[PDB]
Amino acid sequence: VSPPPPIADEPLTVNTGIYLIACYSLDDKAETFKVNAFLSLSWKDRRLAFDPVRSGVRVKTYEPEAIWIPEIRFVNVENARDADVVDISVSPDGTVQYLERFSARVLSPLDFRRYPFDSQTLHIYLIVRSVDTRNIVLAVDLEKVGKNDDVFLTGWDIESFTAVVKPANFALEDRLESKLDYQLRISRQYFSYIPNIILPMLFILFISWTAFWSTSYEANVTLVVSTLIAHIAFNILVETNLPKTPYMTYTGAIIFMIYLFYFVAVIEVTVQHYLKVESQPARAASITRASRIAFPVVFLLANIILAFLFF
Amino acid sequence: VSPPPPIADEPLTVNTGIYLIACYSLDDKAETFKVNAFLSLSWKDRRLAFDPVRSGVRVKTYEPEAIWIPEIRFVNVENARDADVVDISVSPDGTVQYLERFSARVLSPLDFRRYPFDSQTLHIYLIVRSVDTRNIVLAVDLEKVGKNDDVFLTGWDIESFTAVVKPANFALEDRLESKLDYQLRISRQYFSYIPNIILPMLFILFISWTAFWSTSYEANVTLVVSTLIAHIAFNILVETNLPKTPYMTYTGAIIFMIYLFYFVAVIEVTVQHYLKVESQPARAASITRASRIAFPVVFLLANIILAFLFF
Amino acid sequence: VSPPPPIADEPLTVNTGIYLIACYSLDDKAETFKVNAFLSLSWKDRRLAFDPVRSGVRVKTYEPEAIWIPEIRFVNVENARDADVVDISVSPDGTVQYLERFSARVLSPLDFRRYPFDSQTLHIYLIVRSVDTRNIVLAVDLEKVGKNDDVFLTGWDIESFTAVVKPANFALEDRLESKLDYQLRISRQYFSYIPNIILPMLFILFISWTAFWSTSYEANVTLVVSTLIAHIAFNILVETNLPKTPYMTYTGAIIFMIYLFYFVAVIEVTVQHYLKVESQPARAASITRASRIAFPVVFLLANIILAFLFF
Amino acid sequence: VSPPPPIADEPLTVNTGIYLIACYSLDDKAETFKVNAFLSLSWKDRRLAFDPVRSGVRVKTYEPEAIWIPEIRFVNVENARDADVVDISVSPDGTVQYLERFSARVLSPLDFRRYPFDSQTLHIYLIVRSVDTRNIVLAVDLEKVGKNDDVFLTGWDIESFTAVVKPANFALEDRLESKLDYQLRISRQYFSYIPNIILPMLFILFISWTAFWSTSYEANVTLVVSTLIAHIAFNILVETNLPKTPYMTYTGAIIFMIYLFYFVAVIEVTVQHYLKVESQPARAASITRASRIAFPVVFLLANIILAFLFF
Amino acid sequence: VSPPPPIADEPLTVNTGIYLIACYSLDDKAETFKVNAFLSLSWKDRRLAFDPVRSGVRVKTYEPEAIWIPEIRFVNVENARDADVVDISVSPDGTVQYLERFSARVLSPLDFRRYPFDSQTLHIYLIVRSVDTRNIVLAVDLEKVGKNDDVFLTGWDIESFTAVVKPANFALEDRLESKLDYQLRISRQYFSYIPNIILPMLFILFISWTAFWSTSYEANVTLVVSTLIAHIAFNILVETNLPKTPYMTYTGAIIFMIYLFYFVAVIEVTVQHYLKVESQPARAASITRASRIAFPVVFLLANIILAFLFF
Ligand SMILES: [Cl-]
Ligand SMILES: [Cl-]
Ligand SMILES: [Cl-]
Ligand SMILES: [Cl-]
Ligand SMILES: [Cl-]
Ligand SMILES: [Cl-]
Ligand SMILES: [Cl-]
Ligand code: NA
Ligand code: NA
Ligand code: NA
Ligand code: NA
Ligand code: NA
Ligand code: NA
């Protein structure tokens, strides 16, 4: 079966629509998400037209095999989509109305710079390759683009699901290709990160700073070193939930900076002890007293600077 | 093959039933479960009717290909169900009796607020899309809804398996859809959490409080800091078995609150030491003596408040 | 193709046999195992009978498609078995001899109460649904039930592979079902648990008890707290290799009890120190001296009691 | 299609050959490996013979469906091999030359006793079941057994790939079976284990022994206990990369033995302290001085004994 | 369908091209990557030639089944590629233009010697087996080799995608094989390793060296031992992201060397203490003072030597 012939030298417009049934498994490390949706296709094949008076019926139902159907593929899917045809309905004028239900693992890049306070734009790219007979162009039937209310993406808030109505038409291997951009705007549910990572991380840091109210070198060494190890544990926990970015993430920046605080706390703890042994506890006292104000102020200011830089 | 024609303008009623054979793999993080069950379908196709006298036979067995079968799909499945037709039996009035055995990974949201003392309602949504010829409506044959005695969901107690008999009939992409809700009520086996997480977590906390019967700053620092790290280990262990909730879970709340107890224990340990060095051990004694009663009382009361709030 | 017609009102007896080729992947957490075996089926279809004189041949070989084959399924499999027909041989009297080679992931519940000294009974349930024409009943041909010598289940000893010869005949969705129980008796190879978990766990506990021969509070605090953490590490290691049981396991019981030993060791260490500071080292000495005998005796006795309760 | 008829009462000899294209994923815990290879089969079917003069052609190419092909299966595969027929070429005398490209996950037991200095013999078992018409026997065409130069098994050295030319002929379910043993001899690349596990493990042990040059009980307790915990971490790391063996492995033996060294080091550290407090530092000095020589000598000798026992 | 017949004794040239659509999942441990690309094939089949005047059409479109298509396979794929034919276009001269869209998990060895500053050459090997009728040779149509702009490999920079135009023609199982090498040059994004592993690892090492400004044996033991454990944690973290190499990697070398620094730091800490107790603090002072300069200088120089050796 060959494509529909043109009235004039016009391209064939295949109207599309994606209706999300189930959206799930957003893998941060793999930068993938799984989708379960309806794909609707509609084009005019004049060869399939009929008189509703003569035939008796108002629409004709065909099996995929029977008629010409455009080869619509997804660009950013890992493997070819699992698709099952729901219905093919031809109107008297030859306006075909195809509907299929699919499921696919979509590969869409994620921006972790503001993690865990980040928002993402997931993409679903519909594509059609033009045939030697005639050129095929994609369109968006906005009436058939949407999502079920039930649709939930665990640990994410679904903002919108829209399509960029004008396709990206380009040449590939000397043939015209019509690409469409279906955008799923989501924003992360940062809540859990606060009692699980952020606050525990701040508590161990504040515990380290109690060394500024202690003259006991042995106790200070225990305080700063122990807490530093809990900080390493938290850094490792965080980097396991994330991929390797060629940029600093917000949480990454905070975590990195906190190492410097531990490093300087050890230096202070060392300096204070050296001075004490050197029979200069008056100078050590001045440094320790300063550190009590210096450490939280420089911490608070450094954080303002980063939130500023990052947001 | 087209759908059965209507006597009058009535919709076609497809009677359904799910009988669970094997239920397994309830993933808390992924909010999914795997099912292995029988799906039974029954509808009237007058075109398939016959005389049992003339034909000799009391029922006719058809291969799926031979006759019209309604396109029944599952809403909340990740990929299309693995189904194998067991039997198709036509009675002479044309009452088709379809049976298939399926397996599917069902995506059903979970409520972790009362974890590990939570109970859940797992869902299985049967759906049918109406055709251009006629409208299809789902029904529940209660005689064919159930589960095998053998059926066990590891670490969960299976309460019930029922169907909401009246379908959710709604329009989707200008066509009628009949949705059915099969509900599997389960409740978690919280037992193991007690000797594995809850009690070990309480023992390390109580060990931290022995610092209230010690004047040794160096020992107290070791006691409180060490136990705090074991608490971090337990917090991490717990959050690995769970997804990121935009709400506090019961265990999450207990765990978070316990950080504050470690924080204040460090403050006490610090205050007591500062006072001792400042040659005011009488005041430090008062604080330490108070802490011995204050810490367990405020702990016990805070827990009453949370269990109250959570249950 | 319809089932064989009955001589009288007798049911059709399908003789079965499972011969294990490869048995592997026993998942303790998932309570599953993978099997690779031969399935043999034999029944009498009088319609397929022939005279060996006239035909010349002593048995006829058919392709599955050509003849009626009973729909034998497995109850406790996650997904439908991957089966490839090896041979179908019909004798002159119409005694069909079907053989297929299959592989399946079988879901069989496990009893962890005596872990790692436990023994299990893995099950393989063959089932047949009776047709409207006639009732089908399963039988066991003991001569075709067995396992290859080569068959090895890693970290387990294979005791036996037998079938419960009398089937469980019951009604399901108003039709007769013949269920057969193939039992694979295995017992765990507990050896490795001894040098990897049990003895290391006992060594850290015994190290904690050296605090009973020390007057140094700071050293005792380090001894008991450090070892307690290694005990937490071992508890976590153990519970990662196991599912969440609504009952205590033998190892679970030992592990839990050992927390109480650490708790009381801290109490002793605390009491001894308090008394020393209170200028009462004579009383502290009595307690410490007692603890040296009390701790191992109460440990040894508590263990006798548990092994007694558990075995 | 029936098997080739015999000239006399001889069995049908199917000549075999496996040529490895890609060998990968040797799972130590699962005792499996994945293979991608060519399978070549050759037998004489007199029915397919032809005159090259009359026909014109020197060999005839058939589609698998067209002719009789022996049912060759693999014994030790988890699931049935993914096979794609490359070519079927019939010579004038009726000598069929089948070639297929397959991929399979082969289950072959591993011996960990000498780990990580172990060598293994991976197996690939070809098998054929005799038919009622005639008996089928496997043979090895050595000219068609081999492996590509490119073939690499990560972290392993491939020694050889040979076939045991005489098949294991035996009865199974009253039918003759011809089994062939394809052996892939490999030996582990132990290199990485030295700077990653062995030496780090020895360094922490030697650090523990510095307690023999210290009179500070508190320091010794820290030294021995800390290092013991790093040893526990290394023991856990090792046992995660390995399955549960009913025997001791070389690394397992070394690791276990090192626990005894930590245990006795604690005993020494305890004894030395008790004696010091008891105002007997002369006796404690003797013990400590001895321990300095005793610990490395008994360590070195114990290791000679084990390497001796193990190799 | 047989292959195209030769004009003279020339081989059939199948022109090839791979156009990468989506490149993803580069597994360092498994040494695999997943690809989603277009495969284009073009050869001359004179039997399919036609007059464009008589036929009317300028190119003819065939279904794969209708015509002879060369059996092109991939050498280094784990399983056979998931391929879906996009188009088959025959020109009047019989120049076939095949296009398919595929996805495959490619197995390509990785060189970790310079990790995480390494660059790799991923391979895709196209292969064709010659038939008994005629020999088949692969060619590269450079105009149909490329990659989409969108193509991103997470944590890697894609340098180039080229094909080695002259095929590797060799005999395999007495038949000619034409192998082509498609090379994807990539280089790792080392950025993240710096704030996540390299700098944290250096901070803990520098913290250990503060023991050179302390006379407190108990504090030094805590400092060096604690930091050593954090170093073990980092070593383990690193070796989990990598496979077991029979060679030293750059990061592996740095990590290993740092153990020696901890070992010698313990020795110094021990020596200094022994001397102090021995009432020789003047000699201990000299050693400690030297260590303050020796440790960073020997560290810095050792690192120059390694970067030199490695790059
Ligand atoms: Cl697609
Ligand atoms: Cl363009
Ligand atoms: Cl074009
Ligand atoms: Cl479905
Ligand atoms: Cl089954
Ligand atoms: Cl096989
Ligand atoms: Cl391939
Ligand atoms: Na079509
Ligand atoms: Na149908
Ligand atoms: Na059949
Ligand atoms: Na300490
Ligand atoms: Na055949
Ligand atoms: Na073809």
Author numbering:
A (entry chain A), B (entry chain B), C (entry chain C), D (entry chain D), E (entry chain E): 5 to 315
Authors' description from the paper:
At present, the best structurally characterized pLGIC is the G. violaceus ligand-gated ion channel (GLIC), of prokaryotic origin. However, the GLIC is a pH-gated channel, activated by lowering the pH, with a maximal activation at pH 4 and a pH50 around 5. We instead found that proton activation is a complex multiple loci mechanism, with the key contribution stemming from the coupling interface between the extracellular and transmembrane domain, with E35 acting as a key proton-sensing residue.
In contrast to the nonsignificant individual mutations, E26, which is found interacting with the bottom of the β4-β5 loop of the principal (+) face, shows a robust decrease of the pH50 when mutated to both Q and A. A combination of E26Q with mutations of vestibular-facing residues that tend to decrease the pH50 produces an obvious decrease in pH50. A structural analysis was performed on E26Q, E26A, E35Q, E35A, E67A, E75A, E82Q, E82A, D86A, D88N, D88A, H127N, E181A, and H277Q mutants, by solving their structure at pH 4. The key mutants at E26, D86, and D88 were solved at pH 4, each showing a structure similar to that of the Wt. All structures were in the apparently open conformation. E26 clearly is an important residue in GLIC function, but other techniques are required to elucidate its mechanistic role. The report identified E26 and E177 to have loss-of-function effects when mutated.
